[PDB]
Enzyme design. Structure first.
Site, PDB file in Angstrom:
ATOM      1  N   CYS A  98       0.812  -1.255   0.000  1.00 37.98           N
ATOM      2  CA  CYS A  98       0.000   0.000   0.000  1.00 37.98           C
ATOM      3  C   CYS A  98       0.804   1.242   0.000  1.00 37.98           C
ATOM      4  CB  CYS A  98      -0.875   0.117   1.248  1.00 37.98           C
ATOM      5  SG  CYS A  98      -1.749  -1.311   1.571  1.00 37.98           S
ATOM      6  N   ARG A 115      -2.998  -5.120  -6.983  1.00 42.10           N
ATOM      7  CA  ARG A 115      -1.594  -4.899  -6.631  1.00 42.10           C
ATOM      8  C   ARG A 115      -0.960  -6.227  -6.226  1.00 42.10           C
ATOM      9  NH1 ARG A 115      -2.589   0.352  -2.812  1.00 42.10           N
ATOM     10  NH2 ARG A 115      -4.560  -0.873  -2.522  1.00 42.10           N
ATOM     11  N   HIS A 164       0.167  -8.542   0.580  1.00 44.98           N
ATOM     12  CA  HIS A 164      -1.141  -7.921   0.630  1.00 44.98           C
ATOM     13  C   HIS A 164      -1.087  -6.440   0.247  1.00 44.98           C
ATOM     14  CE1 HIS A 164      -0.680  -5.073   4.031  1.00 44.98           C
ATOM     15  NE2 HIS A 164       0.198  -5.937   4.513  1.00 44.98           N
ATOM     16  N   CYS A 165      -2.188  -5.858  -0.186  1.00 48.44           N
ATOM     17  CA  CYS A 165      -2.458  -4.466   0.220  1.00 48.44           C
ATOM     18  C   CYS A 165      -3.828  -4.447   0.849  1.00 48.44           C
ATOM     19  CB  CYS A 165      -2.287  -3.361  -0.865  1.00 48.44           C
ATOM     20  SG  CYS A 165      -2.844  -1.661  -0.132  1.00 48.44           S
ATOM     21  N   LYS A 166      -4.823  -3.980   0.099  1.00 42.73           N
ATOM     22  CA  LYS A 166      -6.203  -3.912   0.590  1.00 42.73           C
ATOM     23  C   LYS A 166      -7.001  -5.177   0.477  1.00 42.73           C
ATOM     24  CE  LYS A 166      -7.865   0.515   2.121  1.00 42.73           C
ATOM     25  NZ  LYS A 166      -8.110   1.963   1.723  1.00 42.73           N
TER      26      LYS A 166
END
Length: 306
Positions: free
Chosen positions: A50, A109, A102-104
């Site tokens: 992120c 991504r 991970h991001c969201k």
């Protein structure tokens, strides 16, 4: 959705040693924290993709590697290659080492990086197959990631490994001198007069063109050919990853992702010859099937270079 052993997480083993997941938030962070200390004690590395959010990296013993990526956008090619270098060292030095990305939502991504990782690790020969595979596990190449540029950047990784020895290609710098848009009718005012084009390099606007007024350009609309051609003026020399955004003053062109009607990334060193033409499925936002009455099948965007 991982269920066993008291945990309830949005978390998936893409392979036995590769994990895709959602944001460890405050998936609650203490539980994501517990899961790794429990299932992978001292053998994990977390990649937070992120650009916009961080968290207490100490819940993971400070084994968190950051890659700054905008939602619905791509890492720099450099960051992408650095990530792969870092994951490779960690993966190859202990059979039990595990990476979690991970991001969201663990979607776009996240798929850009695990798909690249899957190519680096030899599970797939092509970007398309790695992408379809991450797609299976986290819902078709568009199951794999959210955007066309995300797909191109996995393609970029593939081409680096196959054609350039796993390293960055020779440097090319460009100027945009032209832009051409086909199947213009039904897109905005249908003649290009509502559009403008923004060139972004390193997060800074580096050129703005406004088509109707001739602001750093001259617009030519040809209704016979249902297209617009725009001479681009005053382009600075471009280098690296470039994002090209099209905005509109028109009320009936919706904004999709990134707060604009359509956009795209490309890397100047990976451009071939004098131009790059993008088909509808290769442009970010028109690639989504809900927009196909606006962007018709022969909708294309071409940049001309010198």
């Amino acid at each position: 959705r991982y269920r066993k052993d008291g945990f309830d997480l949005d978390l998936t083993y893409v392979t036995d040693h590769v994990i895709a997941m959602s944001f460890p938030s405050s998936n609650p962070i203490g539980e994501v924290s517990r899961f790794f200390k429990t299932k992978h004690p001292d053998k994990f590395r977390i990649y937070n993709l992120c650009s916009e959010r961080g968290y207490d990296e100490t819940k993971f013993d400070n084994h968190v590697y950051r890659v700054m990526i905008d939602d619905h956008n791509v890492p720099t090619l450099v960051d992408l290659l650095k990530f792969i270098d870092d994951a490779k060292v960690w993966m190859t030095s202990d059979p039990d080492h595990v990476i979690a990305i991970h991001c969201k939502a663990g979607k776009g991504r996240t798929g850009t990086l695990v798909s690249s990782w899957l190519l680096e690790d030899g599970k797939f020969d092509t970007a398309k197959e790695a992408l379809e595979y991450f797609g299976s596990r986290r819902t078709d190449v568009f199951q794999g990631v959210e955007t066309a540029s995300q797909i191109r950047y996995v393609g970029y990784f593939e081409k680096i490994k196959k054609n350039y020895g796993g390293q960055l290609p020779p440097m090319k710098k460009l100027k945009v001198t032209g832009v051409t848009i086909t199947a213009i009718q039904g897109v905005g005012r249908g003649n290009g007069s509502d559009l403008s084009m923004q060139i972004v390099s390193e997060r800074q606007e580096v050129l703005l063109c406004k088509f109707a007024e001739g602001y750093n350009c001259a617009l030519q609309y040809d209704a016979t050919d249902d297209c617009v051609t725009c001479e681009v003026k005053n382009c600075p020399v471009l280098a690296g990853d470039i994002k090209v955004r099209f905005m509109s003053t028109s009320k009936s062109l919706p904004r999709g992702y990134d707060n604009c009607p359509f956009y795209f990334w490309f890397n100047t060193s990976l451009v071939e010859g004098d131009h790059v033409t993008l088909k509808r499925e290769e442009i970010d936002n028109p690639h989504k099937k809900k927009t196909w009455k606006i962007y018709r099948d022969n909708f294309t965007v071409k940049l001309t270079f010198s």
